[PDB]
Design a protein around this motif. Structure first.
Motif, mmCIF file in Angstrom:
data_model
loop_
_atom_site.group_PDB
_atom_site.id
_atom_site.type_symbol
_atom_site.label_atom_id
_atom_site.label_comp_id
_atom_site.label_asym_id
_atom_site.label_seq_id
_atom_site.Cartn_x
_atom_site.Cartn_y
_atom_site.Cartn_z
ATOM 1 N N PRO A 8 -36.001 -18.087 20.714
ATOM 2 C CA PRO A 8 -36.218 -19.350 20.014
ATOM 3 C C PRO A 8 -34.957 -19.875 19.323
ATOM 4 O O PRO A 8 -34.173 -19.096 18.786
ATOM 5 C CB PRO A 8 -37.325 -19.081 18.997
ATOM 6 N N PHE A 9 -34.759 -21.194 19.326
ATOM 7 C CA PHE A 9 -33.580 -21.869 18.769
ATOM 8 C C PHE A 9 -32.229 -21.296 19.237
ATOM 9 O O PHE A 9 -31.213 -21.454 18.565
ATOM 10 C CB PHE A 9 -33.681 -21.958 17.241
ATOM 11 N N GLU A 10 -32.184 -20.641 20.397
ATOM 12 C CA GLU A 10 -30.929 -20.251 21.025
ATOM 13 C C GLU A 10 -30.251 -21.445 21.701
ATOM 14 O O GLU A 10 -30.918 -22.352 22.206
ATOM 15 C CB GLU A 10 -31.198 -19.151 22.044
ATOM 16 N N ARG A 11 -28.922 -21.427 21.773
ATOM 17 C CA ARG A 11 -28.115 -22.354 22.579
ATOM 18 C C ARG A 11 -27.116 -21.561 23.413
ATOM 19 O O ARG A 11 -26.544 -20.586 22.934
ATOM 20 C CB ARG A 11 -27.460 -23.382 21.649
ATOM 21 N N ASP B 20 -34.403 -15.733 15.108
ATOM 22 C CA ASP B 20 -34.657 -17.141 15.469
ATOM 23 C C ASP B 20 -33.417 -18.048 15.346
ATOM 24 O O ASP B 20 -33.476 -19.174 14.855
ATOM 25 C CB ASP B 20 -35.870 -17.692 14.704
ATOM 26 N N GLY B 21 -32.251 -17.528 15.731
ATOM 27 C CA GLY B 21 -30.982 -18.245 15.629
ATOM 28 C C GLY B 21 -30.444 -18.415 14.205
ATOM 29 O O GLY B 21 -29.344 -18.934 14.050
ATOM 30 N N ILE B 53 -26.937 -20.501 13.084
ATOM 31 C CA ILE B 53 -25.922 -20.323 14.133
ATOM 32 C C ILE B 53 -26.429 -20.570 15.566
ATOM 33 O O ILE B 53 -25.657 -21.014 16.408
ATOM 34 C CB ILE B 53 -25.267 -18.932 14.018
ATOM 35 N N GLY B 54 -27.699 -20.288 15.870
ATOM 36 C CA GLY B 54 -28.307 -20.442 17.199
ATOM 37 C C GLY B 54 -27.722 -19.559 18.313
ATOM 38 O O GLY B 54 -27.884 -19.873 19.491
ATOM 39 N N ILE B 55 -27.019 -18.477 17.968
ATOM 40 C CA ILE B 55 -26.111 -17.737 18.864
ATOM 41 C C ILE B 55 -26.542 -16.279 19.041
ATOM 42 O O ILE B 55 -27.085 -15.658 18.128
ATOM 43 C CB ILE B 55 -24.661 -17.898 18.346
ATOM 44 N N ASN B 56 -26.290 -15.731 20.232
ATOM 45 C CA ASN B 56 -26.629 -14.365 20.619
ATOM 46 C C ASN B 56 -25.552 -13.368 20.165
ATOM 47 O O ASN B 56 -24.361 -13.616 20.341
ATOM 48 C CB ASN B 56 -26.800 -14.364 22.145
#
Ligand SMILES: *[C@@H]1O[C@H](CO)[C@@H](O[C@@H]2O[C@H](CO)[C@@H](O)[C@H](O)[C@H]2NC(C)=O)[C@H](O)[C@H]1NC(C)=O
Lengths: 42, 64
Positions: A8-11, B20-21, B53-56
């Motif tokens: 979820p909410f990844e880019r 959740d980012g 951040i929305g990042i892995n």
């Protein structure tokens, strides 16, 4: 053709090719090796 | 590249977790009188920041 798409909410803006089969594609386009972003055609 | 933000005795403790980012940071700063190991005792870390951040993440490194 400007607009494009492929947790979820990844880019995820990574430009690496679809290795769509067993081939290590090495960025080379061909059967089972495809560019990762499609586009719309509005 | 979508995001940017600004704001032995000295033991500094942190917790880093990603959900959740968001990237969530908790911390605690304290004096100590010990060298080899973390002191046998107790206090709780408190929240600093909660960054969208929305990042892995799977790997990290520390800057000396
Ligand atoms: C976050 O990053 C990890 C890699 O560090 C990704 O895990 C890999 O995912 C691919 C998907 O095809 C697998 O083939 C690999 O075996 C996975 N590697 C490991 C070490 O698990 C993960 O998918 C990423 N997640 C997102 C949402 O980007």
């Amino acid at each position: 053709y400007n607009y494009r798409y492929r947790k979820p909410f990844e880019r995820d803006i990574s430009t690496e090719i679809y290795q769509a089969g067993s081939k290590p594609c090495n960025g080379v386009e061909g059967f089972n090796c495809y560019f990762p972003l499609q586009s719309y055609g509005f | 590249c979508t995001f940017e933000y600004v704001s032995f005795k000295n033991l500094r403790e942190f917790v880093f977790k990603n959900i959740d980012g968001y990237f969530k940071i908790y911390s605690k700063h304290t004096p100590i009188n010990l060298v080899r190991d973390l002191p046998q005792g107790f206090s709780a870390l408190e929240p600093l920041v909660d960054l969208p951040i929305g990042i892995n993440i799977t790997r990290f490194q520390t800057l000396l």
